[PDB]
Write a protein that binds this ligand. Structure first.
Ligand code: LDR
Length: 186
């Protein structure tokens, strides 16, 4: 119903901190991480899992979920924490591969200042998101929904390059869960 949330900081001593920090660092180790937080939102989580369960029935043996990054402004954080990456949020994003929410394979893509805009204290914000990418195809600028696979079987997301992906564009409510917030600076 309400999608209230709690924010919990991971301590640098926690192995969970080190795993998440490690995924970011793979391409963003030149930045200084200041905190990693888990976003605990049970309703959003339950809606996301209900949607993963539906995709896992449909796609057979596909690994439907990936852990991807998303940079945004401090201003959007409260929105994402409560709502996830909404249909309304999708107006924030770039357009080259369609009108949806964009998620990067690598964190440096997300660390770009036009995505993870530094706030008034020079701090930048990137989520490490669980995303139900499912079965994907190429995107283009004309898209607001994923294409069908044979013009009623639809693709789940689109990407910039099916074989060597750098991004994925999700179009649906509850298709991604903003699990971790990473706060950092140059
Ligand atoms: O992390 C990203 N955040 C975004 C935020 C708003 C618009 C686009 C992007 C985006 C686009 C491509 C790859 C990553 C991102």
């Amino acid at each position: 119903k309400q999608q209230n949330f709690c924010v919990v900081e991971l301590l640098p001593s926690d192995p969970e901190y080190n795993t998440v920090a490690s995924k970011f660092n793979q391409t963003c180790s030149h930045f200084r991480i200041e905190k990693i937080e888990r976003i605990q939102n049970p309703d959003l989580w339950n809606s996301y899992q209900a949607k993963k369960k539906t995709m896992d029935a449909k796609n057979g043996q596909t690994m439907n979920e990936k852990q991807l990054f998303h940079g945004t402004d401090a201003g959007s954080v409260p929105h994402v924490n409560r709502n996830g990456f909404n249909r309304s949020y999708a107006g924030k994003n770039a357009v080259a591969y369609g009108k949806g929410t964009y998620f990067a394979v690598n964190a440096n893509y997300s660390a770009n200042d036009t995505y993870s805009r530094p706030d008034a204290n020079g701090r930048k914000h990137v989520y490490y998101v669980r995303v139900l990418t499912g079965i994907y195809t190429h995107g283009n600028h004309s898209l607001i929904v994923p294409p069908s696979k044979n013009p009623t079987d639809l693709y789940d997301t689109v990407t910039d390059n099916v074989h060597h992906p750098s991004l994925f564009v999700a179009f649906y409510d509850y298709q991604a869960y903003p699990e971790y917030l990473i706060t950092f600076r140059k």
